[PDB]
Symmetry: C3
Amino acid sequence: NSTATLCLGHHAVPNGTIVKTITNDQIEVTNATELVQSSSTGGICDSPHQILDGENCTLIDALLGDPQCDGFQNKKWDLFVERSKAYSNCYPYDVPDYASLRSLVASSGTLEFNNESFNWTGVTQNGTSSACKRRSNNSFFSRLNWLTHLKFKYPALNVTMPNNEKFDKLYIWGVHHPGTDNDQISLYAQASGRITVSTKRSQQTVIPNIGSRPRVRDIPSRISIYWTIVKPGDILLINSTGNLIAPRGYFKIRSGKSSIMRSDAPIGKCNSECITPNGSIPNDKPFQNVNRITYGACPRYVKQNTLKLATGMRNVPEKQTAIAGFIENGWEGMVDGWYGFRHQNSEGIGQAADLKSTQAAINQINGKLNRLIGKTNEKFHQIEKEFSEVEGRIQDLEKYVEDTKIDLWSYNAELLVALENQHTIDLTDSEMNKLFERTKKQLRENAEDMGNGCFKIYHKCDNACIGSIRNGTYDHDVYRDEALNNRFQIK
Amino acid sequence: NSTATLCLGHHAVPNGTIVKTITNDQIEVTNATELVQSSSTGGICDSPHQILDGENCTLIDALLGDPQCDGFQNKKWDLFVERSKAYSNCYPYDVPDYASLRSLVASSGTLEFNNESFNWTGVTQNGTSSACKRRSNNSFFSRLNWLTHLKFKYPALNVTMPNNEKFDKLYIWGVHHPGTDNDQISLYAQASGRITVSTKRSQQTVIPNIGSRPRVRDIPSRISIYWTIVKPGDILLINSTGNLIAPRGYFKIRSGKSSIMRSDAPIGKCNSECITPNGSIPNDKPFQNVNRITYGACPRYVKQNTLKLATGMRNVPEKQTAIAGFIENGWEGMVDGWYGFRHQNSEGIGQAADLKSTQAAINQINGKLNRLIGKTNEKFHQIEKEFSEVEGRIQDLEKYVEDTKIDLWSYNAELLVALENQHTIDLTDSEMNKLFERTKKQLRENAEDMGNGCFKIYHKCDNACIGSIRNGTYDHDVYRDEALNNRFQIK
Amino acid sequence: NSTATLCLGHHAVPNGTIVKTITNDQIEVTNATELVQSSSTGGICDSPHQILDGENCTLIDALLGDPQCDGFQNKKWDLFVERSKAYSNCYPYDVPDYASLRSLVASSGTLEFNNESFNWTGVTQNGTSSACKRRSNNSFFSRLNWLTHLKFKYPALNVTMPNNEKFDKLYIWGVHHPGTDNDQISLYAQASGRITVSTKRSQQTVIPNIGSRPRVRDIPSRISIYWTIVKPGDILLINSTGNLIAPRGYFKIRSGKSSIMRSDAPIGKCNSECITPNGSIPNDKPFQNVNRITYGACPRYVKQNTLKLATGMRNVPEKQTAIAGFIENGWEGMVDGWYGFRHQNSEGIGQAADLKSTQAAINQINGKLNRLIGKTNEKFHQIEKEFSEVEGRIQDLEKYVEDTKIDLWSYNAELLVALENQHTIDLTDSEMNKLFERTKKQLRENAEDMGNGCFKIYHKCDNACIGSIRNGTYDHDVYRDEALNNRFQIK
Ligand SMILES: CC(=O)N[C@H]1[C@H](O[C@H]2[C@@H](O)[C@@H](CO)O[C@@H](O[C@H]3[C@H](O)[C@@H](O)[C@H](O)O[C@@H]3CO)[C@@H]2O)O[C@H](CO)[C@@H](O[C@@H]2O[C@H](CO[C@]3(C(=O)O)C[C@H](O)[C@@H](NC(C)=O)[C@H]([C@H](O)[C@H](O)CO)O3)[C@H](O)[C@H](O)[C@H]2O)[C@@H]1O
Ligand SMILES: CC(=O)N[C@H]1[C@H](O[C@H]2[C@@H](O)[C@@H](CO)O[C@@H](O[C@H]3[C@H](O)[C@@H](O)[C@H](O)O[C@@H]3CO)[C@@H]2O)O[C@H](CO)[C@@H](O[C@@H]2O[C@H](CO[C@]3(C(=O)O)C[C@H](O)[C@@H](NC(C)=O)[C@H]([C@H](O)[C@H](O)CO)O3)[C@H](O)[C@H](O)[C@H]2O)[C@@H]1O
Ligand SMILES: CC(=O)N[C@H]1[C@H](O[C@H]2[C@@H](O)[C@@H](CO)O[C@@H](O[C@H]3[C@H](O)[C@@H](O)[C@H](O)O[C@@H]3CO)[C@@H]2O)O[C@H](CO)[C@@H](O[C@@H]2O[C@H](CO[C@]3(C(=O)O)C[C@H](O)[C@@H](NC(C)=O)[C@H]([C@H](O)[C@H](O)CO)O3)[C@H](O)[C@H](O)[C@H]2O)[C@@H]1O
Ligand SMILES: *[C@@H]1O[C@H](CO)[C@@H](O[C@@H]2O[C@H](CO)[C@@H](O[C@H]3O[C@H](CO)[C@@H](O)[C@H](O)[C@@H]3O)[C@H](O)[C@H]2NC(C)=O)[C@H](O)[C@H]1NC(C)=O
Ligand SMILES: *[C@@H]1O[C@H](CO)[C@@H](O[C@@H]2O[C@H](CO)[C@@H](O[C@H]3O[C@H](CO)[C@@H](O)[C@H](O)[C@@H]3O)[C@H](O)[C@H]2NC(C)=O)[C@H](O)[C@H]1NC(C)=O
Ligand SMILES: *[C@@H]1O[C@H](CO)[C@@H](O[C@@H]2O[C@H](CO)[C@@H](O[C@H]3O[C@H](CO)[C@@H](O)[C@H](O)[C@@H]3O)[C@H](O)[C@H]2NC(C)=O)[C@H](O)[C@H]1NC(C)=O
Ligand SMILES: *[C@@H]1O[C@H](CO)[C@@H](O)[C@H](O)[C@H]1NC(C)=O
Ligand SMILES: *[C@@H]1O[C@H](CO)[C@@H](O)[C@H](O)[C@H]1NC(C)=O
Ligand SMILES: *[C@@H]1O[C@H](CO)[C@@H](O)[C@H](O)[C@H]1NC(C)=O
Ligand SMILES: *[C@@H]1O[C@H](CO)[C@@H](O)[C@H](O)[C@H]1NC(C)=O
Ligand SMILES: *[C@@H]1O[C@H](CO)[C@@H](O)[C@H](O)[C@H]1NC(C)=O
Ligand SMILES: *[C@@H]1O[C@H](CO)[C@@H](O)[C@H](O)[C@H]1NC(C)=O
Ligand SMILES: *[C@@H]1O[C@H](CO)[C@@H](O)[C@H](O)[C@H]1NC(C)=O
Ligand SMILES: *[C@@H]1O[C@H](CO)[C@@H](O)[C@H](O)[C@H]1NC(C)=O
Ligand SMILES: *[C@@H]1O[C@H](CO)[C@@H](O)[C@H](O)[C@H]1NC(C)=O
Ligand SMILES: *[C@@H]1O[C@H](CO)[C@@H](O)[C@H](O)[C@H]1NC(C)=O
Ligand SMILES: *[C@@H]1O[C@H](CO)[C@@H](O)[C@H](O)[C@H]1NC(C)=O
Ligand SMILES: *[C@@H]1O[C@H](CO)[C@@H](O)[C@H](O)[C@H]1NC(C)=O
Ligand SMILES: *[C@H]1O[C@H](CO)[C@@H](O)[C@H](O)[C@H]1NC(C)=O
Ligand SMILES: *[C@H]1O[C@H](CO)[C@@H](O)[C@H](O)[C@H]1NC(C)=O
Ligand SMILES: *[C@H]1O[C@H](CO)[C@@H](O)[C@H](O)[C@H]1NC(C)=O
């Protein structure tokens, strides 16, 4: 009746989701996406990383050449997977600083071994044992050479092996600790004497220690395992009078991205960049709470089991019912846009979405998704994060380093999502406010703000007229005389 | 005189506090709260954690059973407190990797000890010394057994102890290093020979080393202390020909939240969750600069000695004097609200607080206090952070880890408080602006904005009329004819 | 023609720079500054830190007193610089835990050495070798004393040295490992026997190990180096029957800010607070990507090679052409201010800068530059971050600690610059909006907002009138009758 109403509004949905911002612990938005990966398939995918399943073998057992590990000879890996069921089935041994040798071989990523012709003149080679059977026969570690007396003599060994290669050589060797004095004489024909293995730059002396240890596979003796790395132009010197478990050659030692993981997860024929002990996980999300132990391009481990990123505006119920605008009121009936117009005029009541404002909001939200989704970074060999034995100081430090790191990342994740969500609420509120202001400015003196997100337009404004406002081509001068007469009359 | 004035405003106080935001290094606000705890009472509260005051005993001395520590037998703790006055008063000893044994016992949290019947047939037991008196008599460590020759014989010991329990056993044992060859013969009846202590999975051999060390309590000999952990189903084997300081049994080893702290603070009868070497501290605040060493639910250590969180709006002086609104002007006379109205009309000049806006600001500020106050997280056994000896590499790493951590937290604290304070300034400014806008919209064409946070209302507006605006029930149509005539007249 | 136009605007430049905000991956601003230092001069400046260039000497060689290092005697440093060309030229030696002794001497920062008169009665002193020539003559390490038999006797040494000083003493000593049994007898007149060096609180026993090692300077023997620190009131006891390489006295050990760095950069006569292996770097910027290894007041190492901080507003092209204001439009022709006014009236078209708004923006931007520029913090002795040998566990941890730290700082840097840039865009947009609003409020009913950042002023407004608006002294009442007649006429 000589006027029209034009309301600005935004959509609302019946099934909103709660997120956290800086302003609110809980605010309902139209939509959100999860940023913490909390599940795994349960299998380790065999692609795209080269996986070596240790099965019954530890890495160190595959290194030394336990008979059940013969199939591992010379293999390489990106990730060596050690199973909890693994067990040793050869001569009982220990490795002082086992963890370091495991780590350096793991990180090298290869079991490539080159045989060398050592001069073992004057002794018997290839000693074997019933504790280490190969094909039903008494045998020994494939890569080691148990030397013993020859005709009750064991002449002093003083043997040399130059490295004339352009790469480093890793030598694995050992010392036999016999159970009794009888065994020492039976084996080496004399009282026990130290072993010295040296290079130009380093030396290691080891003393065999005769004595009973608890029997393992009926063996009260032990072998202790040692290693030496020899640089190009340097030379290995082995100097011994008995009890030497000699190397048969050297391992290549490489540098690269290889590592080792303890897991019982089955290996599957599938493709996934991120491996955890629980299985591979998708790496679309920036964070994960599956496992602190990871390999490959992985989300960062956090303590939270959920962090929701807002991907829509505040969700506001529609007040019950004349048309009304956005002030404390969303429009559940607007489904083809995020923002729009409702009008009442001589021709009826209508709605239309505003594409520009809708797309501006969507684009910005898609931008922040692009920065956070699918952007994980790769890590490879790290530190151990679970321990089967009590050790004290070094382990305390490894644990504290990891705890420190996780708490700092968890804090960053918490803040980032709160900040981002606050920004999303702000940018979507801003698009609504900007649409209102643009409309107010078009209308000039021809309308008044009713306080509810609507304008009272003080002239006849048919569908085409409303359309012109929505399209930004309304000419206020055309209607100003009519509007001013209607506004500034005296009733 | 046919018009009225209505001003919107906010409170101000005579005693503001300076805070830091993103926008300003220094901005005065009405109120702030401290987020860094910088004082302690000076006492360690004996509740709610179980405290064991070591008094004159170190943990290791209480473990071995120095006579002054007899009262500690079998005790447990959450926190063992070692005093700087502590001193050893038994046979002089050392512990290779003392720090690891201290840590693992500390973390276990128990001195529970179970005696075992070892077969020491063929030797003399219970050797004692004047360096270790108990009840005026020559004695020895309670948990160790000094074995010596019997009738000038010391037969080879080869003794076994199975672990048929479902828990791990910790064995503490030692090697006696005599001062002279005479002492070696006097004690063990033969030349010194190695000691080997083994299990199915591990072995340790130790060689006694005869020689003078500087006398301590007139003793030039030493004992070196070692330990072995034995798993269920495994067995301890002790193999020796002399110089054995034998175990009398095993310690339980537990897992849990126990630790150890160096402090001289007195223990008080009080209750506090957070313990530092300086004493317990309140844990209401999120940060603290009392000590990097903490136990329990503690604020995080930061370098800052103060960080002030704004808990009110910007504090703005009242300009000297017609009434005026919030533009560059606070109202020191408004004491029953944070925001409000002042008016001038035919009936006088008045003020009233606006409850809604005040409560909206207060609630949001209380929300952020709730997130930051009383929300500390517990940490228990960590790494050492002060050192009495120079050590090199491992200590360099422990120090760098802690320095790294503190700098990262200090940075997070600095940013968080700057961000939060900026947000508080923004939300309180926003409540003022929203109140102004709501009022502007009610008034429609009946008022004009004077530019100083006040409206000139162009009609007679008595106390009830002003009240209607404040209460949001003002009907602009009632007054529009009057107002339009007054506004758009020609003077 | 009875009206005027007044536009509000902001400057724009032809050569903008792209930065990152929270809202935009790429937004062009008028100006930016770099926060990551990415270059070095290539030289280490000799001021203000005390630099000691090791030249051909390692620290350990200068400690022991290799003849080519005689010039280093008693020197101090803030930073010891070790060169890759360095080489040893004396008796072949090793140091078990070399890295720890290097670190503790490096951190101490002094080679001050005090000679002491040990009682070496009964042996020959000052043994020398052709492997260690000094001034063409056979010689030895300056700080060590090679003792050998006297008249084919080597009586048991049992020598004492009390520390009656108020500071700690560092003793460096060694054990000679002869190449053959012949050398052992030639040198010490008897079979090899252990060396024991002790104090009241500690003990070290070392066993000489006879054997061939690969010849170095024709020497198949080795010396192994050890150290002992003696506290005030404690005493050094040296107990040996041969193979002792004895100390000639002690090194002072100090605490302070000294360290050691590997670098081949030349030392220059210049002044710079921050040293890296690549050379000194300026420390104005908060971050750097030159080297993770630093000494002194240094920017923090990050992975990014550039991070640009906005130092101006959004840069917006001027739309082509009536005058127009800031809505989607910058003014390339405004060069004496950041914000200003353009007008059209009876006297022409003019421009003037607004000083207040310009200065408000500049001051705030200068504030944030002041917080970020020239504010670096000092670090001194840290951990090693590059390694020439494979080691396993400890090295894995040192690497993981550093990687962790760098990733956390890189994240903080990324967020900080995004937040700061968002804040800069917001504060500069805000100054534009505030200027517009202040002007709108002055004009009251005498103007209408044209929607393009300009006002249509509905009265004659000559240069002085425009000036009054700009200066904030425009009196709207003077013109209101004229303006209202022009606005609310009927055409
Ligand atoms: C080297 C050897 O075979 N040792 C056997 C050992 O042999 C001695 C024994 O037969 C006596 C009997 O009088 O004779 C000695 O020979 C002397 C001879 O009398 C004299 O004329 C001459 O001048 O001097 C020689 C000394 O050289 C024999 O030396 O017998 C004992 C008791 O039966 C064996 O102990 C048992 O070992 C069992 C495991 O057997 C192996 C194994 O591991 O499978 C056999 C391997 O061939 C042998 N390996 C090598 C490289 O020799 C190993 C090795 O000896 C041990 O593993 C070391 O711990 O033993 C099983 O452990 C059982 O429980 C033992 O009682 C011993 O092996
Ligand atoms: C084991 C013992 O008591 N050792 C004494 C030692 O005893 C020898 C001495 O009396 C000579 C004298 O001729 O006789 C020897 O006996 C031989 C005998 O002649 C011969 O017939 C027979 O066939 O062989 C035996 C050898 O077994 C004795 O062995 O005397 C010296 C010098 O007086 C003592 O040194 C002094 O020790 C003082 C501390 O005394 C204790 C202690 O710590 O309290 C007494 C303890 O009972 C003893 N503990 C045990 C378990 O035996 C310890 C222990 O020996 C030391 O602590 C080891 O370092 O000593 C104090 O240190 C003083 O300064 C020393 O001069 C030695 O203890
Ligand atoms: C101590 C010494 O000079 N050792 C020489 C060694 O001397 C023995 C040799 O001349 C025989 C010959 O019959 O005689 C021995 O003397 C005995 C004598 O016969 C007997 O009557 C008496 O009762 O007993 C003595 C034993 O004390 C000599 O002891 O000769 C060998 C072979 O020539 C030398 O080896 C060579 O060493 C070369 C390096 O020489 C130095 C060096 O480093 O410069 C000389 C230094 O003076 C010496 N330092 C000291 C403190 O003595 C060192 C030191 O011995 C070595 O470094 C230890 O490794 O050697 C070079 O290495 C060459 O390749 C070797 O063949 C040996 O040095
Ligand atoms: C030191 O004490 C050890 C523990 O008592 C002892 O170990 C053990 O020796 C016995 C036999 O001497 C083993 O028992 C085996 O012997 C029969 C003999 O034919 C075999 O048929 C069986 O396999 C039987 O198990 C024990 O297994 C073994 N115990 C342990 C824990 O290792 C050492 O022999 C003693 N050492 C010396 C040098 O005497
Ligand atoms: C190797 O040298 C050591 C240092 O000189 C020496 O240590 C000491 O020995 C003396 C006695 O021999 C102790 O002095 C004590 O002796 C009288 C004798 O009755 C007592 O009354 C007093 O208690 C007096 O203090 C020293 O205390 C002691 N010094 C140190 C630093 O330990 C060793 O005895 C020598 N070793 C050998 C095997 O000869
Ligand atoms: C154990 O084996 C070692 C390696 O074969 C051996 O080392 C070396 O000994 C030879 C001489 O015996 C050195 O050669 C030098 O000898 C002549 C003799 O006049 C000199 O003119 C030259 O300097 C020549 O180089 C080797 O340099 C040396 N090789 C290494 C790698 O060190 C040991 O001698 C053997 N040990 C025993 C105890 O026999
Ligand atoms: C909600 O958000 C996510 C991410 O933008 C999108 O993939 C999903 O389809 C959205 N859901 C709805 C119902 O719009
Ligand atoms: C591993 O050992 C188990 C148990 O001894 C055996 O049954 C299984 O066949 C073994 N697996 C492989 C792959 O050798
Ligand atoms: C090393 O070899 C030499 C002979 O070349 C010999 O005399 C010596 O005993 C050997 N050393 C050891 C520790 O076996
Ligand atoms: C993965 O395994 C770890 C270690 O056993 C366990 O703590 C965790 O609950 C597992 N997580 C998932 C998602 O299966
Ligand atoms: C200031 O703030 C704190 C925390 O909100 C509050 O406990 C205190 O009483 C306030 N002081 C005043 C004077 O309002
Ligand atoms: C601890 O030792 C001191 C000094 O010897 C003694 O006076 C005090 O009584 C001792 N305290 C306890 C609790 O045994
Ligand atoms: C261990 O016991 C055996 C006898 O069972 C003995 O012959 C041997 O000497 C002992 N070993 C040691 C190192 O004491
Ligand atoms: C607590 O003790 C530490 C360590 O001695 C000291 O540096 C610090 O000043 C103390 N802090 C307080 C608040 O007493
Ligand atoms: C741009 O910014 C920097 C830092 O404020 C300033 O030093 C430089 O001179 C500025 N450049 C221009 C062209 O204004
Ligand atoms: C260091 O050694 C090189 C190569 O032997 C020599 O030429 C140079 O003069 C030496 N420099 C110094 C400072 O002694
Ligand atoms: C230490 O000195 C004593 C004599 O005082 C001597 O008997 C003993 O052999 C020496 N010990 C060593 C390990 O050299
Ligand atoms: C500095 O040296 C390091 C280590 O060699 C190298 O990686 C880096 O590229 C260098 N940086 C610059 C800016 O020269
Ligand atoms: C062990 O040595 C024998 C000779 O005794 C040789 O024939 C054989 O090749 C060696 N065993 C190997 C290489 O497995
Ligand atoms: C030490 O052994 C004796 C027998 O020599 C025994 O009676 C006593 O119980 C033992 N001492 C203890 C358990 O304290
Ligand atoms: C080594 O001892 C000799 C006496 O044999 C002495 O004259 C000389 O000063 C000592 N050498 C030094 C201190 O360099």
